[PDB]
């Protein structure tokens, strides 16, 4: 036995570029940089990850190369197109 029910619900909160701030801030943290930083230069760099990034790095010269996460190459799909003449 199991009767419908009914919850709350909600929807996108304000549109504030500052809570979006975070949003970018969260990779650059995933990667290995803290907030101090990825916070300043974003803020400079028009809000862009590439930007900051390079500007994060450009600092000191670590071993470790950039990249998003499983960052793996796809672009694979059996399928063959002979032709005629």
């Known amino acids: 036995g199991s009767s ?36 300043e230069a974003l803020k400079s760099n028009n809000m862009n990850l590439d930007q900051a990034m390079s500007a994060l790095l450009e600092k000191k010269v670590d071993v470790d190369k950039r990249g998003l996460g499983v960052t793996d190459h796809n672009g694979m799909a059996a399928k063959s197109g002979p032709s005629s003449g």
Request: proline share 6%.
């Open 4 to 39: 419908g029910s009914s919850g709350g619900m909600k929807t996108s909160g304000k549109q504030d570029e500052a809570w979006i701030m975070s949003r970018l801030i969260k990779q650059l943290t995933d990667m290995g940089f803290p907030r101090e930083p990825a916070e």
